[PDB]
Symmetry: C2
Subunit: 542 residues, 2 copies
């Protein structure tokens, strides 16, 4: 009768390799699975196929045609599913998008900009890989009884150096953060959330996609694959009984799925299981900023630093103050036209009790023209852009909850804080690397810091999701910038040095001196000769 007998499982990404095996195996374990997808012919072909493979009654298989990106299509779809079945016992977030396969500078943002091998926009990649699971957890959760299971399917590569794969890998890093936070709020309901990290799984498709990554790098046959096989601790037998490092099967993923769906995992919430044959990859890239800053870096003379901000004007004031004492010129770009307004008002406060405030220009990720516009002005007036500090689009988080939240806010957090932050970086990377092919005599070196908002009573839940995205972006933006550097140097092209980046998290501090402390290191890190290795730099309570 099977281990999931009588339970109702919803599986997204039913078409994909992994989604198909999860369906066949849950059917064999006695579940009624509903597969959800975008094309009505595709699901019906799959469901007939998955019925035939399982050897199961007809009413035990079902489908719902949905656009998992649209939360109102999700409300429609869930209501239909409930009305036939009453409740959902397992929710499996599979999400088969693979992302555009391009470097950070070359990522597509609009359909016109779309090309071969890059079939979705960035925002579509974010809405598929991070939005979809988020919307289900919010809408299905009121129909899941005490004892239910959410399963989120991530990848191992969301924490690994994965060349050219930012639109895929970054919303995955964000989803992990989403899972842990959803475990808190759904755990208080008796609903458990847990996560699977498949390694490289066996496919005909994955064979070609390691090749495209190999071609994007310099490197020959087998390169990306042999490297990850070598992080594997566990060898396995072949038919002759010899040991070997190979990829896991799709059935391995489904074993971990069944366990996490059945009542044999009833006491677990917030756990992760890496189906990788024990690929060993470093987990923590953090450190505390514990030392005093020492602004003896008047080396910032001539260099000019961009501040991407908006609505956080206390941070902008200190940031320009620090950077000016270093000798750096500052350009400041407010992301919403509103933020310019009360900033001009703040300088009006400055004119009382009075000396010059900096230049403010529009800098909007929705309208990537104004980013390119800012670069052009900087070349004519301030002699370039040499460093950037990037802030959250908003000062405060939209809501205290990750599950119990309206539809509009969640769509805004996706467009503003996640896609919009990637956009700024992708224009930065192309800027510095379209110029690196220019210089003749000798050049300085570019640096980036992402500086978060201060501690919040929410526990900074939305900020922490954003932080997980910024982290994995840096991991890959360092890696690409380095390989593009050494490669373009093989061309003999005297190129600007590769971009370095860090982020400073302020979540454990909410003091006025805490702000000045964090802004001074921002100025120190943008223009120092040395660098810090850790990706995330934490400022303590002090």
């Amino acid at each position: 009768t099977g281990r999931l007998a009588g339970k109702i499982a919803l599986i997204t990404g039913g078409a994909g390799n992994i989604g198909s095996e999860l369906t066949r195996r849950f059917l064999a374990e006695g579940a009624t699975v509903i597969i959800s997808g975008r094309n009505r012919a595709k699901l019906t072909a799959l469901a007939e196929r998955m019925q035939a493979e399982a050897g199961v009654p007809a009413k035990r298989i079902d489908l719902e045609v949905m656009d998992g990106s649209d939360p109102v299509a999700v409300r429609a779809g869930i209501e239909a599913i409930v009305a036939r079945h009453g409740q959902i016992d397992i929710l499996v977030n599979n999400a088969g998008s693979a992302g555009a396969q391009r470097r950070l500078a070359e990522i597509p943002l609009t359909e016109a900009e779309l090309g071969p091998g890059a079939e979705e926009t960035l925002h579509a990649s974010i809405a598929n890989l991070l939005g979809m699971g988020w919307h289900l957890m919010r809408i299905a959760a009121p129909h899941m009884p005490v004892g239910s299971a959410v399963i989120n399917v991530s990848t191992i590569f969301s924490r690994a150096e994965y060349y050219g794969r930012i639109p895929y890998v970054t919303p995955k890093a964000a989803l992990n953060a989403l899972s842990q936070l959803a475990a808190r709020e759904l755990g208080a309901r008796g609903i458990r959330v847990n996560t699977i990290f498949p390694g490289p799984i066996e496919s005909d498709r994955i064979r070609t996609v390691f090749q495209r990554m190999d071609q994007l790098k310099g490197r020959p046959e087998g390169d990306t694959a042999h490297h990850f096989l070598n992080t594997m601790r566990l060898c396995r037998a072949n038919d002759q009984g010899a040991l070997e490092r190979r990829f896991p099967s799709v059935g391995d993923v489904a074993d971990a799925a069944v366990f996490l769906a059945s009542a044999e995992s009833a006491a677990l919430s917030g756990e992760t299981i890496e189906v990788t044959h024990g690929m060993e990859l470093p987990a923590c890239s953090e450190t505390s900023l514990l030392a005093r800053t020492d602004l003896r870096t008047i080396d910032a003379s001539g260099r000019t630093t961009l501040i991407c901000a908006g609505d956080q004007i206390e941070e902008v004031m200190a940031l320009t103050g620090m950077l000016r004492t270093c000798g750096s010129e500052v350009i400041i770009g407010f992301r919403s036209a509103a933020a310019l307004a009360q900033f001009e008002q703040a300088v009006n406060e400055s004119r009382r009790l009075a000396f010059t405030p900096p230049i403010a220009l529009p800098l909007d990720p929705r309208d990537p023209a104004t980013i390119d516009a800012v670069f052009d002005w900087a070349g004519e007036n301030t002699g370039g852009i040499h460093a950037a500090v990037i802030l959250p689009a908003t000062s405060h988080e939209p809501a205290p909850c990750v599950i119990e939240v309206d539809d509009e806010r969640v769509l805004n957090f996706l467009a503003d804080e996640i896609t919009g932050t990637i956009v700024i970086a992708s224009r930065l990377a192309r800027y510095w690397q379209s110029q690196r092919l220019t210089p003749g005599a000798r050049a300085r070196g570019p640096r980036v810091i992402f500086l978060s908002n201060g501690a919040d009573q929410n526990g900074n839940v939305y900020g922490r999701i954003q932080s997980a995205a910024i982290g994995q972006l840096i991991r890959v933006w360092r890696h690409e910038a380095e390989l593009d550097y050494q490669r373009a140097s093989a061309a003999g092209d005297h190129v600007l040095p590769p971009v370095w980046a860090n982020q400073i998290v302020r979540f454990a501090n909410r003091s006025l001196e805490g702000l000045e402390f964090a802004c001074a290191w921002t100025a120190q890190l943008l223009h120092s000769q040395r660098h810090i290795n850790e990706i995330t730099l934490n400022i303590p309570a002090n």
Copy 2:
């Protein structure tokens, strides 16, 4: 037929709630279980009850009577187990003896020093809770076919503040690190190693031991209990359908065990599963020393520092140089009788412009010579105020943790693990045995530099020292605040950190790490992170 059908499982720690429920459950999934233990009456008693409990044939159960601490006893026992059954499919490392329950100053080291409520030596607690699983993993491995599973059962509290529980919690944290490292070497044999972290599991027993922990900490009923329940993210239903935060059951733990013993987890190695109702605990408490030191802390005038080391003569010199410029006096106590030799040899080379400190034997094997060091310090240097503790040996004993002989592994346990807790406990007892105003004692444990091994023995050692520090701070805070209310004028509480330099192998990094050691011992502030990392620079 069941999920472990035909599989041969050796289960240590067969008695007690978790070990028993694992035996009955493996029997229900069709395995033949061998339970391993110390008393033949207890094992034969265990086999009959669980034979009756499982409702399973007799030849399905078996026992081996052995001293799991003795590797020569293990060779005898495993070879015999193989002789009855041919092979081993599952190894479950349970152990779980609770250790002697005393504060670091009062922990027993010799049978005479044993007392009521403290029934094991320190070394015995280490030989049970860390060695046994280690020796099984080494000796059983040549009898485990490709596809086998090792399950190491730790506790969630191996990362927790547990007043009076150092002999328990410190070898568990060590065993964790040991598991990860062996996954590399056993993975190359086709063998899985994976780890279960039970939370506080429900018993009538744990009710009472939370009551005793409440009493030692001075805090009232439920204080220790509510503290762990409130970290739990996952609620569960009661019989009437209402939600509540309660502890997991014993069967919840055995569900995860069956998963990790069965071929449904065939692609897993180096994983951990926390059966905790989603207890939320901070994972990383580490930080990098990124700044340059600044020795304007002549606050060390009059204060005197003990250096515990041996065979690391370059650090011993760099340390005395650092500490003297701060104004501290230095005593050096070498851990091996060898270490005196080449130090006395090096100083003869220099003088044949350098004035060496007094160098004395200081051996945790013989805790008498520790009291000797304190005695000289009282007559001569006006006391001991700060300590630096270094590994008993500079170079790692072996490149492997599994393919390694018995003597080396036994020496590593005696010196680097039991011997390092020994030093800490006499330090804590010294400082706490003691009208106007007082200064404050400080400790830093300094690791060896980077190794071609990746420092596997160093990482096992460091993992224990980390949890050692957590509880040594915790006890010191409560021991202080309590004893001073009695009106006894005692020193302020001990603080400690460790400096791990495994990611650096340059001489300037060596000087950098020695400099931070001196600064941290005599500075007024303190660093909260327990583990302090020096980068490559």
